[PDB]
Design a binder for this molecule. Sequence first.
Ligand SMILES: Nc1nc2c(ncn2[C@@H]2O[C@H](COP(=O)(O)OP(=O)(O)O)[C@@H](O)[C@H]2O)c(=O)[nH]1
Length: 369
Amino acid sequence: REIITLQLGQCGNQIGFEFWKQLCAEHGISPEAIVEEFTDRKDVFFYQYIPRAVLLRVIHSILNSPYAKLYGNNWASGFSQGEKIHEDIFDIIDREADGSDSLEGFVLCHSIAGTGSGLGSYLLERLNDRYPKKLVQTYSVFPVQPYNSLLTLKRLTQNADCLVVLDNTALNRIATDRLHIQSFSQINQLVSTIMSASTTTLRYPGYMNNDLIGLIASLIPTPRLHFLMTGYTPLTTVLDVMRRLLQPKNVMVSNHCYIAILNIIQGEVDPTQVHKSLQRIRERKLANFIPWGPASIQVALSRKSPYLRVSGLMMANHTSISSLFERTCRQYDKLRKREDNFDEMDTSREIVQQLIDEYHAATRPDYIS
Ligand SMILES: Nc1nc2c(ncn2[C@@H]2O[C@H](COP(=O)(O)OP(=O)(O)O)[C@@H](O)[C@H]2O)c(=O)[nH]1
């Protein structure tokens, strides 16, 4: 099973290039796409070595980078231009798809803030049209801006079978707090770190989580609640890691309870103390769960890249994320009363209102019906 990734817009292209840099460094692959001498399953993201990427001005910057051997501002303009070159890009996508043995998904890295937003909208629609059996995960990055953002949310709440949010505000906050920057090229480091650590269990095989469905179907219980948040504590026992992870100081997010939690530990820790960690976490009652269905926290281990200490990442399904949408929603209303049919934006507002209502109803003991 092979995962193909797509990079749209300046932000998406930059974060994808840095992610590929990080991943090539994790393995023994020189910038010249030649394996270095110096166990790690690398077939998923690399083709025998060339990455499975589809880039769509900064391309010249990448071509001038040492890694050359490795390959307007409106939403409506982006959508129109994406409709204009449907066949041109889809020939590339189809040749790269059918060239693969068994395709699995379509990772999409883009910022919902110019042309990237509408282009990703169009691509998501067309991929939902053509390929009906391919999971679509999206590493979308959150910031006339409210218009584009809400349109992207409208297209993402029904097409993408999963989604991971990344807000530049929280990243900048963490940068000023514990990195003391005052830049794109600095927050992108942490972004690429989180991304590389996200797909750790796919490249280093373990007891469980050998496929994307193993990561998705565990967290997302219903097809609507498919927005996740990330946490990365190392910026030592597993209990300390789990206690530092659940702190709101580290989560990349600007009653309420949890739906599903997943922990990935990349250290050489003793794997016998994890059950004690979970026992004590349940004892002290540091986190709450849904009252209707039985929801638990899952933990998995892995191995750090030997060619490159204890780290850890956390993927959560928290109902608080809806708050962010509200802000956008709010701004849209503020933008709707200040200034062919202009009805698509109204439908977008309607469906995002539906989604926020569903999130707000999810935290009730009678969420069913
Ligand atoms: N987190 C992050 N966001 C970025 C970076 N570069 C650009 N962005 C976002 O991308 C948006 C600009 O997109 P733009 O390049 O104009 O899209 P285009 O019109 O299709 O080229 C801004 O609102 C930024 O928030 C980056 O390095 N990191």
